[PDB]
Amino acid sequence: INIQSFKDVEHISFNFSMLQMAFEASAAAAGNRNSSSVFLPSRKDCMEVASAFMKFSKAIEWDMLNVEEEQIVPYIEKLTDGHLRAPLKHGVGILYKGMASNDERIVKRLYEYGAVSVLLISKDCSAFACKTDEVIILGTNLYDGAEHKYMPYTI
Amino acid sequence: SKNEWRKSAIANTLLYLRLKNIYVSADDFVEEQNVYVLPKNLLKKFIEISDVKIQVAAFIYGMSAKDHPKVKEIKTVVLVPQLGHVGSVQISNIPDIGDLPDTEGLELLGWIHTQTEELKFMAASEVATHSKLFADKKRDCIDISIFSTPGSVSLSAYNLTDEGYQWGEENKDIMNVLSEGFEPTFSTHAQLLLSDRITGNFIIPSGNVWNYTFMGTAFNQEGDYNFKYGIPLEFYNEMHRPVHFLQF
Amino acid sequence: TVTKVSLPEGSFKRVKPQYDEIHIPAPSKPVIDYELKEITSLPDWCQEAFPSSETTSLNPIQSKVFHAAFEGDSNMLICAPTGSGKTNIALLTVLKALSHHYNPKTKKLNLSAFKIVYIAPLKALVQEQVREFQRRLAFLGIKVAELTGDSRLSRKQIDETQVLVSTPEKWDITTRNSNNLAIVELVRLLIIDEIHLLHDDRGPVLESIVARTFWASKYGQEYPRIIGLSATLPNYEDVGRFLRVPKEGLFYFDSSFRPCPLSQQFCGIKERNSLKKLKAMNDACYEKVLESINEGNQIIVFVHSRKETSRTATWLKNKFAEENITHKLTKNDAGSKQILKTEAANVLDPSLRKLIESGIGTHHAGLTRSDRSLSEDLFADGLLQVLVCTATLAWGVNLPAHTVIIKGTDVYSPEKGSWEQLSPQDVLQMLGRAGRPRYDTFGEGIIITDQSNVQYYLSVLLPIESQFVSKLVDNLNAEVVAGNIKCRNDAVNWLAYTYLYVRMLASPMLYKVPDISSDGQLKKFRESLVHSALCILKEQELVLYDAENDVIEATDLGNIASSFYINHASMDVYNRELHTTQIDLFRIFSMSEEFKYVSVRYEEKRELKQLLEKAPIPIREDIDDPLAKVNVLLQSYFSQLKFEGFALNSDIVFIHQNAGRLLRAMFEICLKRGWGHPTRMLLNLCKSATTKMWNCPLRQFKTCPVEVIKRLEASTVPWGDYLQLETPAEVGRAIRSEKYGKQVYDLLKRFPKMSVTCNAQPITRSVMRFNIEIIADWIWDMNVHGSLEPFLLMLEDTDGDSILYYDVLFITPDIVGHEFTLSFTYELKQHNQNNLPPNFFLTLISENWWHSEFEIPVSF
Interface list for chain C against chain A, based on CB atoms closer than 8 Å: 218-219, 807, 818, 820-825
Burial class (CB in 10 A: 0-12, 13-18, 19+), B66: exposed
Query: What is the tally of structural domains in chain A?
Result: 1
The answer to whether the CB atoms of C807 and A151 lie below 8 A apart is no
Amino acid identity of A78? K
Distance from CA of A115 to the nearest CA of C (A): 26
The answer to whether the CB atoms of C857 and B230 lie below 8 A apart is yes
- Which residues on C lie below 8 Å from A147 (Cβ)? 820-821
The answer to whether the CB atoms of C581 and B13 lie below 8 A apart is yes
Is B243 an 8 Å CB contact of chain C?
A: no
Is A149 an 8 Å CB contact of chain C?
A: yes
Phi then psi for residue B51, to 5 deg, are -100, 160
Residues C319-352, buried b or exposed e (16+ Cβ, 10 A)? bbeeeeeeebbbeeeeebbeebeebbeeebeeeb
Contact C22, C268 (CB under 8 A): yes
Phi then psi for residue C768, to 5 deg, are -115, 130
- Which residues on C lie below 8 Å from A24 (Cβ)? none
- Which residues on C lie below 8 Å from A152 (Cβ)? 823, 825
Which residue is closest to C618 within chain B, CA to CA? B6
Nearest of A66, A68, A76 to residue A106 by alpha carbon: A76
The parent domain of residue A84 ranges over 1-155
Which residue is closest to C800 within chain B, CA to CA? B231
Is B206 an 8 Å CB contact of chain C?
A: no
Contact C183, C112 (CB under 8 A): no
The answer to whether the CB atoms of A149 and C824 lie below 8 A apart is no
Instruction: Return d(Cα C496, Cα C730) in angstroms, integer.
Output: 72
Going by the DSSP 8-state scheme, the letter that residue C233 receives in this structure is: -
DSSP letters of C236-275?
Answer: HHHHHHHTT--GGGEEE--GGG-SSPEEEEEEEE---SHH
The answer to whether the CB atoms of C807 and A149 lie below 8 A apart is no
Within a 10 A sphere around the Cβ of C400, how many other Cβ atoms?
22
Instruction: Return d(Cα C484, Cα C48) in angstroms, integer.
Output: 46
Binding-site residue ranges of C: 80-87
Instruction: Return d(Cα C84, Cα C75) in angstroms, integer.
Output: 20
Phi then psi for residue B115, to 5 deg, are -160, 160
Is B13 an 8 Å CB contact of chain C?
A: yes
The answer to whether the CB atoms of C219 and A149 lie below 8 A apart is no
Phi then psi for residue C717, to 5 deg, are -60, 135
Point out the residue among A59, A148, A152 whose CB comes nearest to the CB of C820. A148
Contact B57, B128 (CB under 8 A): no
| CA angle (B109, B213, B175) in 5-degree steps | 75
3-state secondary structure C426-480: HHHHHCCCECCCCCCCCEEEEEEEEHHHHHHHHHHCCCCCCCCCCCHHHHHHHHH
Instruction: Return d(Cα C533, Cα C558) in angstroms, integer.
Output: 13
Distance from CA of B231 to the nearest CA of C (A): 6
The answer to whether the CB atoms of B201 and C837 lie below 8 A apart is yes
Instruction: Return d(Cα C534, Cα C516) in angstroms, integer.
Output: 23
- Which residues on C lie below 8 Å from B247 (Cβ)? 616
Nearest of C62, C73, C374, C380 to residue C223 by alpha carbon: C73
Element (H, E) at B132: helix B124-134
Domain with residues C555-694, CATH architecture: Orthogonal Bundle (1.10)
Within a 10 A sphere around the Cβ of C248, how many other Cβ atoms?
11
Q: Whats the size of chain B, residue-wise? A: 248
Q: Where are the domains of chain C?
A: 1-29+259-461, 30-258, 466-554, 555-694, 695-751, 752-860
Distance from CA of B61 to the nearest CA of C (A): 16
Instruction: Return d(Cα B192, Cα B130) in angstroms, integer.
Output: 18
Amino acid identity of C574? Y
Instruction: Return d(Cα B131, Cα B61) in angstroms, integer.
Output: 18
Element (H, E) at C577: helix C568-577
Going by the DSSP 8-state scheme, the letter that residue B231 receives in this structure is: P
DSSP letters of C135-175?
Answer: HHHTTTT--EEEPPSS-SGGGTTTTT-SEEEE-HHHHHHHH
Which residue is closest to C825 within chain A, CA to CA? A152
Contact A143, A44 (CB under 8 A): no
Question: In angstroms, what CA-CA distances link C632 with C609, C627, C641, C651?
Answer: 10, 9, 11, 12
Residue C569 in 3-state DSSP?
A: helix
Partners for B (CB, 8 Å, 3+ pairs)?
C
**CB contacts < 8 Å between B and C, how many?**
26
- Which residues on A lie below 8 Å from C219 (Cβ)? 55, 59
Binding-site residue ranges of C for ATP: 80-87
What's the reported resolution, in angstroms, to a tenth? 3.8
Contact C339, C383 (CB under 8 A): yes
- Which residues on C lie below 8 Å from A151 (Cβ)? 823
Q: Residue C690: which region, alpha, beta or left (left: phi > 0; alpha: psi -120 to 50)?
A: alpha
Point out the residue among A11, A55, A147 whose CB comes nearest to the CB of C821. A147
Torsion of CA C593, C598, C600, C602, to 10 degrees: 150
Instruction: Return d(Cα C313, Cα C362) in angstroms, integer.
Output: 7
> Is CATH 1.10.3720.10 the classification given to domain C1-29+259-461?
no
Going by the DSSP 8-state scheme, the letter that residue B99 receives in this structure is: T
Contact C125, C119 (CB under 8 A): no
Phi then psi for residue C807, to 5 deg, are -170, 155
Which residue is closest to C614 within chain B, CA to CA? B248
| CA angle (C683, C686, C690) in 5-degree steps | 140
Same fold, C1-29+259-461 and C30-258: yes
Contact B116, B87 (CB under 8 A): yes
- Which residues on C lie below 8 Å from A142 (Cβ)? none
Torsion of CA C544, C548, C549, C553, to 10 degrees: 10
Query: Which residues, 6+ apart, have CB-to-CB distance to C858 below 8 Å?
Result: C758, C759, C760, C770, C795, C839, C840, C841, C842
Question: In angstroms, what CA-CA distances link C77 with A84, B113, C88, C663?
Answer: 50, 79, 15, 41
Amino acid identity of C842? L
Which residue is closest to C769 within chain A, CA to CA? A152
- Which residues on C lie below 8 Å from A143 (Cβ)? none
Question: In angstroms, what CA-CA distances link C594 with C130, C248, C624, C651?
Answer: 25, 41, 19, 12
Which residue is closest to A8 within chain C, CA to CA? C807
Contact B158, B129 (CB under 8 A): no
- Which residues on A lie below 8 Å from C821 (Cβ)? 147-149
Best residue of A8, A10, A21, A153 to probe chain C, by most C CBs closer than 10 Å:
A10
Instruction: Return d(Cα A53, Cα A72) in angstroms, integer.
Output: 18
Instruction: Return d(Cα A14, Cα A6) in angstroms, integer.
Output: 9
Best residue of C761, C822, C825, C827 to probe chain A, by most A CBs closer than 10 Å:
C822
Contact C185, C115 (CB under 8 A): no
Is B201 an 8 Å CB contact of chain C?
A: yes
Query: Which residues, 6+ apart, have CB-to-CB distance to B179 below 8 Å?
Result: B124
Contact C182, C146 (CB under 8 A): no
Domain with residues C466-554, CATH architecture: Orthogonal Bundle (1.10)
Instruction: Return d(Cα C199, Cα C207) in angstroms, integer.
Output: 10
Is beta strand B57-64 parallel, antiparallel or unpaired with respect to B71-79?
Answer: antiparallel
Distance from CA of C620 to the nearest CA of B (A): 13
The answer to whether the CB atoms of B245 and C800 lie below 8 A apart is no
Burial class (CB in 10 A: 0-12, 13-18, 19+), C104: exposed
- Which residues on C lie below 8 Å from B231 (Cβ)? 798-800
- Which residues on C lie below 8 Å from A59 (Cβ)? 218-219
Query: Which residues, 6+ apart, have CB-to-CB distance to A51 below 8 Å?
Result: A87
Query: Which residues, 6+ apart, have CB-to-CB distance to B58 below 8 Å?
Result: B46, B77, B78, B79, B80, B111, B112, B113
Instruction: Return d(Cα C267, Cα B84) in angstroms, integer.
Output: 76
Residues facing B193 on adjacent strands? B37
Phi then psi for residue C24, to 5 deg, are -135, 110
Going by the DSSP 8-state scheme, the letter that residue C179 receives in this structure is: T
Residue A139 in 3-state DSSP?
A: coil
The answer to whether the CB atoms of C579 and B230 lie below 8 A apart is no
- Which residues on C lie below 8 Å from B101 (Cβ)? 859
The answer to whether the CB atoms of C823 and A148 lie below 8 A apart is no
| Helix/strand/coil percent split, chain A, to 5 | 40, 15, 45
Residue C651 in 3-state DSSP?
A: helix
Instruction: Return d(Cα C763, Cα A150) in angstroms, integer.
Output: 18
Specify the CATH number for the domain of residue A28.
3.40.50.300
- Do chains C and A have 3 or more beta-carbon pairs under 8 angstroms? yes
In the CATH hierarchy, which fold is given to the domain comprising C752-860?
A: Immunoglobulin-like (2.60.40)
> Is CATH 1.10.150.20 the classification given to domain C695-751?
yes
Partners for C (CB, 8 Å, 3+ pairs)?
A, B
Within a 10 A sphere around the Cβ of B171, how many other Cβ atoms?
19
Question: In angstroms, what CA-CA distances link B242 with B213, B214, B216, C682, C716?
Answer: 11, 8, 12, 19, 12
- Which residues on C lie below 8 Å from A154 (Cβ)? none
Contact C196, C460 (CB under 8 A): no
| Helix/strand/coil percent split, chain B, to 5 | 25, 30, 45
**CB contacts < 8 Å between A and C, how many?**
18
Residue C415 in 3-state DSSP?
A: coil
Cα dihedral across residues B178, B184, B189, B194: positive or negative: positive
The answer to whether the CB atoms of A147 and C824 lie below 8 A apart is no
Is beta strand B142-149 parallel, antiparallel or unpaired with respect to B107-115?
Answer: parallel
Tell me, rounded to whole angstroms, the distance of Cα C60 from its chain centroid. 34
Q: Residue C435: which region, alpha, beta or left (left: phi > 0; alpha: psi -120 to 50)?
A: left
Element (H, E) at C607: helix C605-613
Query: Which residues, 6+ apart, have CB-to-CB distance to C173 below 8 Å?
Result: C152, C565
Contact C630, C598 (CB under 8 A): yes
Contact C803, C674 (CB under 8 A): yes
Q: List the helix and strand counts (H, then E) for chain A.
A: 5, 6
Distance from CA of B68 to the nearest CA of C (A): 22
Instruction: Return d(Cα C645, Cα C576) in angstroms, integer.
Output: 39
Question: In angstroms, what CA-CA distances link C736 with A155, C733, C740, C746, C751?
Answer: 61, 5, 9, 16, 21
Distance from CA of B230 to the nearest CA of C (A): 7
The answer to whether the CB atoms of B201 and C838 lie below 8 A apart is yes
Query: Which CATH superfamily groups domain C30-258?
Result: P-loop containing nucleotide triphosphate hydrolases (3.40.50.300)
